Design a protein around this motif. Structure first.
Motif, mmCIF file in Angstrom:
data_model
loop_
_atom_site.group_PDB
_atom_site.id
_atom_site.type_symbol
_atom_site.label_atom_id
_atom_site.label_comp_id
_atom_site.label_asym_id
_atom_site.label_seq_id
_atom_site.Cartn_x
_atom_site.Cartn_y
_atom_site.Cartn_z
ATOM 1 N N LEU A 24 4.460 -17.096 26.528
ATOM 2 C CA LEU A 24 3.933 -17.337 25.188
ATOM 3 C C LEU A 24 2.420 -17.166 25.236
ATOM 4 C CD1 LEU A 24 6.032 -20.476 24.111
ATOM 5 C CD2 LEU A 24 6.561 -18.009 23.834
ATOM 6 N N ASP A 25 1.901 -16.168 24.519
ATOM 7 C CA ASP A 25 0.540 -15.658 24.742
ATOM 8 C C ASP A 25 -0.243 -15.625 23.428
ATOM 9 O OD1 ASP A 25 -1.782 -14.300 25.516
ATOM 10 O OD2 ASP A 25 -0.712 -12.605 26.460
ATOM 11 N N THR A 26 -0.958 -16.712 23.127
ATOM 12 C CA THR A 26 -1.684 -16.783 21.864
ATOM 13 C C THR A 26 -2.867 -15.816 21.818
ATOM 14 O OG1 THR A 26 -2.999 -18.677 22.678
ATOM 15 C CG2 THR A 26 -0.970 -19.175 21.477
ATOM 16 N N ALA A 28 -2.581 -12.694 22.568
ATOM 17 C CA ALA A 28 -1.982 -11.394 22.320
ATOM 18 C C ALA A 28 -1.669 -11.263 20.831
ATOM 19 C CB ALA A 28 -0.713 -11.223 23.150
ATOM 20 N N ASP A 29 -2.213 -10.219 20.192
ATOM 21 C CA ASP A 29 -1.810 -9.915 18.818
ATOM 22 C C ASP A 29 -0.351 -9.497 18.778
ATOM 23 O OD1 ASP A 29 -4.610 -10.188 18.455
ATOM 24 O OD2 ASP A 29 -4.877 -8.054 18.018
ATOM 25 N N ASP A 30 0.084 -8.781 19.801
ATOM 26 C CA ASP A 30 1.342 -8.065 19.776
ATOM 27 C C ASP A 30 2.210 -8.532 20.932
ATOM 28 O OD1 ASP A 30 0.445 -6.155 17.642
ATOM 29 O OD2 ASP A 30 -0.951 -5.592 19.211
ATOM 30 N N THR A 31 3.505 -8.276 20.797
ATOM 31 C CA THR A 31 4.490 -8.596 21.819
ATOM 32 C C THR A 31 4.730 -7.363 22.685
ATOM 33 O OG1 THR A 31 5.552 -10.345 20.534
ATOM 34 C CG2 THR A 31 6.911 -9.178 22.142
ATOM 35 N N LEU B 24 -8.597 -19.161 22.091
ATOM 36 C CA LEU B 24 -7.749 -20.132 22.776
ATOM 37 C C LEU B 24 -6.496 -19.397 23.249
ATOM 38 C CD1 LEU B 24 -7.996 -23.199 20.403
ATOM 39 C CD2 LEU B 24 -9.546 -22.551 22.252
ATOM 40 N N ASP B 25 -6.413 -19.114 24.551
ATOM 41 C CA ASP B 25 -5.440 -18.153 25.074
ATOM 42 C C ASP B 25 -4.476 -18.804 26.068
ATOM 43 O OD1 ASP B 25 -4.010 -16.047 25.881
ATOM 44 O OD2 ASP B 25 -5.732 -14.764 26.403
ATOM 45 N N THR B 26 -3.298 -19.164 25.576
ATOM 46 C CA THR B 26 -2.276 -19.726 26.443
ATOM 47 C C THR B 26 -1.738 -18.713 27.439
ATOM 48 O OG1 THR B 26 -0.549 -19.200 24.839
ATOM 49 C CG2 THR B 26 -1.602 -21.343 24.685
HETATM 50 C C1 LIG Z 1 -0.758 -9.299 29.577
HETATM 51 C C2 LIG Z 1 -2.068 -10.029 29.900
HETATM 52 C C3 LIG Z 1 -1.922 -11.534 30.127
HETATM 53 C C4 LIG Z 1 -0.868 -11.933 31.187
HETATM 54 C C5 LIG Z 1 -1.215 -11.375 32.560
HETATM 55 C C6 LIG Z 1 -3.300 -12.087 30.531
HETATM 56 N N1 LIG Z 1 -4.345 -11.763 29.544
HETATM 57 C C7 LIG Z 1 -4.605 -12.719 28.448
HETATM 58 C C8 LIG Z 1 -4.017 -12.148 27.155
HETATM 59 O O1 LIG Z 1 -3.921 -13.146 26.189
HETATM 60 C C9 LIG Z 1 -4.900 -11.005 26.631
HETATM 61 C C10 LIG Z 1 -6.223 -11.545 26.080
HETATM 62 C C11 LIG Z 1 -7.025 -10.371 25.485
HETATM 63 C C12 LIG Z 1 -7.621 -9.319 26.397
HETATM 64 C C13 LIG Z 1 -8.401 -8.151 25.829
HETATM 65 C C14 LIG Z 1 -8.612 -8.048 24.337
HETATM 66 C C15 LIG Z 1 -8.033 -9.101 23.424
HETATM 67 C C16 LIG Z 1 -7.239 -10.271 23.994
HETATM 68 N N2 LIG Z 1 -4.241 -10.400 25.504
HETATM 69 C C17 LIG Z 1 -3.645 -9.081 25.519
HETATM 70 O O2 LIG Z 1 -3.745 -8.310 26.432
HETATM 71 O O3 LIG Z 1 -2.937 -8.798 24.345
HETATM 72 C C18 LIG Z 1 -2.425 -7.417 24.087
HETATM 73 C C19 LIG Z 1 -1.315 -7.509 23.530
HETATM 74 O O4 LIG Z 1 -1.625 -7.700 22.047
HETATM 75 C C20 LIG Z 1 -2.968 -7.022 21.862
HETATM 76 O O5 LIG Z 1 -3.953 -8.087 21.254
HETATM 77 C C21 LIG Z 1 -5.023 -8.284 22.253
HETATM 78 C C22 LIG Z 1 -4.919 -7.278 23.117
HETATM 79 C C23 LIG Z 1 -3.403 -6.703 22.993
HETATM 80 S S1 LIG Z 1 -5.779 -11.054 30.174
HETATM 81 O O6 LIG Z 1 -6.816 -11.001 29.156
HETATM 82 O O7 LIG Z 1 -5.461 -9.728 30.721
HETATM 83 C C24 LIG Z 1 -6.322 -12.134 31.492
HETATM 84 C C25 LIG Z 1 -5.984 -11.791 32.920
HETATM 85 C C26 LIG Z 1 -6.428 -12.748 34.009
HETATM 86 C C27 LIG Z 1 -7.204 -13.986 33.625
HETATM 87 C C28 LIG Z 1 -7.655 -14.974 34.691
HETATM 88 C C29 LIG Z 1 -7.909 -14.247 35.997
HETATM 89 O O8 LIG Z 1 -6.592 -15.858 34.784
HETATM 90 C C30 LIG Z 1 -7.538 -14.320 32.201
HETATM 91 C C31 LIG Z 1 -7.079 -13.388 31.093
#
Ligand SMILES: CCC(CC)CN(C[C@@H](O)[C@H](Cc1ccccc1)NC(=O)O[C@H]1CO[C@H]2OCC[C@H]21)S(=O)(=O)c1ccc([C@H](C)O)cc1
Lengths: 99, 99
Positions: A24-26, A28-31, B24-26
């Protein structure tokens, strides 16, 4: 339920008739789900993450069950490191953050 | 407060004396902040997500205030496109997922 965050918020999902584990990834905009077979038509799309942009297959109006809560929405399939449930489906199941 | 997920869960934080907006990123184990020139010891690290890896600098015992809630812990600094508050700090401010 109420989910604390001392551990990763992993849940079992049901999609295409098969069970999987997803995060569950708040943030992330998308799944986005790892490579898998899904029935139906799809269109190629791009999505960007922390490390750059990847090519995915966009499936629209897909039935997915998340902890027994039903959602019907877009599922992206491609080389994500982890199966993530994003806000497009978290909103459908009534998910909020609280503190 | 209660934060719905129709839009990105962006909040104002205070770190190193500066105000910033952050997710806030779960889905993040740890906290990743935009490039900034913080004082103190650090160690290099590579962190991965969609699209691959970026190089960050890991600072320990950093004080961040999130919507008036204080937290102190590990922060990774580098060329992330967004400031990300991860579970290491979300736990400290009492944040839960609810549905
Ligand atoms: C699959 C990735 C997950 C699980 C591994 C982890 N991620 C957080 C996730 O929430 C990212 C957050 C994000 C990143 C870039 C731009 C916007 C939001 N969201 C995201 O990729 O979402 C995609 C889908 O929907 C679209 O909206 C947003 C972008 C598109 S992380 O960032 O890579 C990351 C990695 C390591 C750490 C430390 C080391 O623990 C901390 C954070």
């Amino acid at each position: 339920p109420q989910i604390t965050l001392w551990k990763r918020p992993l849940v079992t999902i049901k999609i295409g008739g098969q069970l999987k584990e997803a995060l569950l990834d708040t943030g992330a905009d998308d799944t986005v789900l790892e490579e898998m077979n899904l029935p139906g038509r799809w269109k190629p799309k791009m999505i960007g993450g922390i490390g750059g942009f990847i090519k995915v297959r966009q499936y629209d109006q897909i039935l997915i069950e998340i902890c027994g809560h039903k959602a019907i929405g877009t599922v992206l399939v491609g080389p994500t490191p982890v199966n993530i449930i994003g806000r497009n489906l978290l909103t459908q199941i009534g998910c909020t953050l609280n503190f």
